[PDB]
Amino acid sequence: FSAFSSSRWEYGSPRLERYNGLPSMEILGQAAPGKSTGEAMELMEQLASK
Amino acid sequence: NGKAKVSLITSDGIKFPQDGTLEFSDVTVDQTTGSITLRAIFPNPDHTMMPGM
Numbered sequence: 370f371s372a373f374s375s376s377r378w379e380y381g382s383p384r385l386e387r388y389n390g391l392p393s394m395e396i397l398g399q400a401a402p403g404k405s406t407g408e409a410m411e412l413m414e415q416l417a418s419k
Numbered sequence: 420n421g422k423a424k425v426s427l428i429t430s431d432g433i434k435f436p437q438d439g440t441l442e443f444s445d446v447t448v449d450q451t452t453g454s455i456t457l458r459a460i461f462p463n464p465d466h467t468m469m470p471g472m
Contacts, residue, residue: 375432 425459430472437462 386393400409422442427435439461448454461468 375430 425457425461427461435461435467 386395398409398413400406422440424438425441426438429435439459442458442460445454445456445458447456449456
C-alpha cells in the first residue's frame, strides 16, 4: 500500500447527528443548584434567540 | 524549440525540481487504450528518478 496509496489527514466529525434529514448538533446542560429548569430553559431562550 | 517541457508530480507529491524535454511523439496507437505514447527525457542529478515507478 505504500507503493501507491498516498495518505494524509483531514477533519471529520464522527457524531454527524441529524434531524429529519437536517444535520444538527445537540447541546446538553443542567440548571443551577437551588434553581429550576424554567429559569434555565427560558434563560437558554434568551440565549438561543440571539 | 517546439520540443516542449515536461515536469513531474512524483510519488511524494512534491514536483521533480527541474523540468525536461518532450523528445518526440509516437504514432503507435495501442489497440486497447488509446496510446499516443510520448517520451519525456529528463536529467537525473541525484538518481532521484528510479526508472520504473
